[PDB]
UniProtKB/Swiss-Prot annotation:
Compartmental location: Mitochondrion
The protein's name: Putative ribosome-binding factor A, mitochondrial
Family membership noted in the UniProt record: Belongs to the RbfA family.
Covered range of the whole protein: 86 to 201 of 343
């Protein structure tokens, strides 16, 4: 879930280092089609990485297109190309704990209306008298 306050100093050090390390390492891999041949062909480019406060799950946002079909194909290839990527990063001993990387759609089409009651109800009386 969450912890709350920051606390120690390193806390922020690991959060910034881990967030930046994964962001720099992740984007670096997408630079050479050596490993991610399919990924490169797509020409994907990271934009922002969202890491959990508990240092458990590691979410990453990548520039997506305006087409579900296109995003699906890219997401499918990028997703399956994550596991291997995770190992490639492990090499960097500097990294203490490397959590699982999960790609999430930026423009995640989310339409959830909070309409429960449907009836114009209200008390008012503009009648002067």
């Amino acid at each position: 879930g969450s912890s709350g306050s920051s606390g120690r100093k390193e806390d922020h050090a690991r959060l910034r280092a881990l967030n930046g390390l994964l962001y720099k390492a992740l984007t670096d891999l997408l630079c050479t089609p050596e490993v991610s041949q399919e990924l490169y062909d797509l020409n994907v480019e990271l934009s922002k990485v969202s890491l959990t406060p508990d240092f458990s799950a590691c979410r990453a946002y990548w520039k997506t297109t305006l087409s579900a079909e296109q995003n699906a194909h890219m997401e499918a290839v990028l997703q399956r190309s994550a596991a291997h990527m995770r190992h490639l990063l492990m090499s960097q001993q500097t990294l203490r704990n490397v959590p699982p990387i999960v790609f999430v759609q930026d423009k995640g089409n989310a339409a959830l209306a909070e309409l429960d009651q449907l009836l114009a109800v209200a008390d008012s009386g503009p009648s002067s008298g």
